[PDB]
């Protein structure tokens, strides 16, 4: 449950699970209520903002 | 005392409560825009407690889809505009307790003593979703003042939880009981999603 904390930052997370956008539509649900500028990097995917 | 229950149903009672619902909304709204008259607001809520509870008494011992319960939802229809004004009031003070506490809001606060400015509060509220613009103007208005940069949020939230911990419970019971006894009425559902 924490060894897999090492994969979210890489820009290749959806490699097999078909859903190669499992990183943009989480950005929008939580989004405003949490730090919009800080979840932009803790899920990798820099330059998002 | 079913024989007595029908007497109040066939009585000039509904036009009294609908008037009460109207006057309850504005003073409950007006009083909150001040810090010195807050003491009167407490016993005003106590009147709400002792008014909704009697509506439960009418509803107790009722049959499903009964005649008494029909007027209960019917009376709410012609008073609808005033009802949701009361309902909306609880939402702001039950979600501001959630906004104040999230670390996202803690970013805009940079004040070791603990206070916050006014314009930054407007930005922080606007940055997040919900809380339509005019409501933000209202929330700023009911806040405190002095120096235009002294808004103690840690105390501003915990000033309507304990006094209004009730009422909100006894309207939750009211809506839930009504929803069960009359299960198919589109008028009733509109209030539930609010």
From Swiss-Prot, chain A:
Cellular compartment(s): Sarcoplasmic reticulum membrane
Tissue specificity: Detected in skeletal muscle (at protein level). Fast- or slow-twitch skeletal muscle.
PTM section of the record: The N-terminus is blocked.
Residues bound to caffeine: 18
Comment text on domains: The calcium release channel activity resides in the C-terminal region while the remaining part of the protein constitutes the 'foot' structure spanning the junctional gap between the sarcoplasmic reticulum (SR) and the T-tubule. Pore opening is mediated via the cytoplasmic calcium-binding domains that mediate a small rotation of the channel-forming transmembrane regions that then leads to channel opening.
Family classification: Belongs to the ryanodine receptor (TC 1.A.3.1) family. RYR1 subfamily.
Note: Binding of [3H]ryanodine indicates that the heterozygous channel is activated by Ca(2+) concentrations 4-fold lower than normal. Single-cell analysis of cotransfected cells shows a significantly increased resting cytoplasmic Ca(2+) level and a significantly reduced luminal Ca(2+) level.
Function: Cytosolic calcium-activated calcium channel that mediates the release of Ca(2+) from the sarcoplasmic reticulum into the cytosol and thereby plays a key role in triggering muscle contraction following depolarization of T-tubules. Repeated very high-level exercise increases the open probability of the channel and leads to Ca(2+) leaking into the cytoplasm. Can also mediate the release of Ca(2+) from intracellular stores in neurons, and may thereby promote prolonged Ca(2+) signaling in the brain. Required for normal embryonic development of muscle fibers and skeletal muscle.
Subunit structure as annotated in this protein's UniProt entry: Homotetramer. Can also form heterotetramers with RYR2. Identified in a complex composed of RYR1, PDE4D, PKA, FKBP1A and protein phosphatase 1 (PP1). Repeated very high-level exercise decreases interaction with PDE4D and protein phosphatase 1 (PP1). Interacts with CALM; CALM with bound calcium inhibits the RYR1 channel activity. Interacts with S100A1. Interacts with FKBP1A; this stabilizes the closed conformation of the channel. Interacts with CACNA1S; interaction with CACNA1S is important for activation of the RYR1 channel. Interacts with CACNB1.
Name listed for the protein in its UniProt record: Ryanodine receptor 1
Naturally occurring in which organism (per UniProt): Oryctolagus cuniculus (Rabbit)
